[PDB]
Design a binder for this molecule. Sequence first.
Ligand SMILES: Cc1cc2nc3c(=O)[nH]c(=O)nc-3n(C[C@H](O)[C@H](O)[C@H](O)COP(=O)(O)OP(=O)(O)OC[C@H]3O[C@@H](n4cnc5c(N)ncnc54)[C@H](O)[C@@H]3O)c2cc1C
Ligand SMILES: O=C(O)c1cc(Oc2ccc(C(F)(F)F)cc2Cl)ccc1[N+](=O)[O-]
Length: 464
Amino acid sequence: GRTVVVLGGGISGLAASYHLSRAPCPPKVVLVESSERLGGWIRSVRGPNGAIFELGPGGIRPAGALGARTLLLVSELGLDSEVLPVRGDHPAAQNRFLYVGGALHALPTGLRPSPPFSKPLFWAGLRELTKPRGKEPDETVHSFAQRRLGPEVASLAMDSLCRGVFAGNSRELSIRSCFPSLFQAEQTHRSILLGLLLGQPDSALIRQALAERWSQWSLRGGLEMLPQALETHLTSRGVSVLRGQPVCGLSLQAEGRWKVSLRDSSLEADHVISAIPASVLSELLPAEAAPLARALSAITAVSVAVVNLQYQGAHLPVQGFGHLVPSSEDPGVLGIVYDSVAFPEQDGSPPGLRVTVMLGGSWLQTLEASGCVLSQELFQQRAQEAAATQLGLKEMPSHCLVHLHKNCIPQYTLGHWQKLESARQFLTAHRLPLTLAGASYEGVAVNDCIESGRQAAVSVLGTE
Ligand SMILES: Cc1cc2nc3c(=O)[nH]c(=O)nc-3n(C[C@H](O)[C@H](O)[C@H](O)COP(=O)(O)OP(=O)(O)OC[C@H]3O[C@@H](n4cnc5c(N)ncnc54)[C@H](O)[C@@H]3O)c2cc1C
Ligand SMILES: O=C(O)c1cc(Oc2ccc(C(F)(F)F)cc2Cl)ccc1[N+](=O)[O-]
């Protein structure tokens, strides 16, 4: 007798529906997805020769309690046979690079001046402990990193790191919202290094991932198998999924029920879990909820072009996960991922070398805001020049895939904590049967989006 609608069929929406429907005494769950497919940015292409090309995340890092919570989900979905781990005894696990000064340079692990840093990194760690503590509520990743680590580390490492995780600009991103652990470390223990030196579910898959030290894992038919398995389960349990059915409007009525408004249809939800972009939810809210909508509309997302390239009979200069490209090296190219190093099983046959070029940054930000045309060709040449320049691959790619993802990665810029705090004070102040979830709020990683989903699910079952 209690209906919960879930908006968005991304991984957050999917996870929420999954936990809701698995409760001992489950409400009626309806999943509402605006596109033809579930899975949101998690999407995979099974090319001609049998190779997988990832269009979003290519694999997932299992480390952390969240890492472990996702491997459990995977066990529960009986996907174990299908898992492709990358084990601690491989280069794809023990090697991330930087393209700096026309060369790839290896980032250290824990073991002498390493290019492109002039001095040993031991020295920055030093002044790190002795350094004061920022007294502001928030701070940009650049400001933070620069202050505690020095100009070199900030301009190269943190700059790249923000690009690799958020496809974003570290002079924009909040250190509080982007690296909450680094931020609490510093705040709590007056020092990043200390807070780290001053510090989990279980199952067979996890024990194995702990033992073999998996640095990441993916699925054999591609990551999309995850949302695929999830959807199969929802549908089994009799959860109701509506594709190609965008939500147009939300509004409350009597008895405090929600009227979800479809194109030419409607649903009454007792509760609503929003797992769609915050900027979208914003446009769906009744003027009753202006101050919340203002908060939501303040959360924006960058775009990303993904270009997959496959080269027949080519080889890389190095073996690693991939490399990052600092903004000072290239505004448009964020990094390249060597998918074959990690997942040779997905190379097809005849097997071919696969890399994935991530395009974005200010290059693409300004093109979006221009009269210019965002052609496939434009992204193709960029990607190819990058592989040719940065990887010495001057062969024509035997295969090529180009995808522009508009507004796909939420940017947690300065003041983000406040936006969240405001949305959350409005919601509770007025006791709205609405829960928030997904990448717009408390993390963009798939691991985060899932926990995001589970927490919204749990909190919704708490209410009844
Ligand atoms: C190329 C790239 C690489 C990435 N790599 C990694 C990585 O490897 N590791 C990692 O952890 N994370 C990675 N991510 C980030 C991560 O994939 C995303 O943050 C996460 O998948 C987003 O999930 P979500 O459910 O929060 O949002 P989304 O996946 O965007 O889902 C939201 C859904 O809501 C739907 N929707 C919108 N409006 C409506 C409406 N009105 N009615 C009904 N439905 C609606 C949309 O169609 C969409 O499907 C990557 C992202 C990108 C794109
Ligand atoms: O660490 C990374 O996240 C890393 C990401 C790379 O590719 C991306 C994947 C995803 C995104 C995303 F999701 F932010 F768009 C950006 C980039 Cl550059 C390439 C290399 C690395 N790395 O550590 O060597």
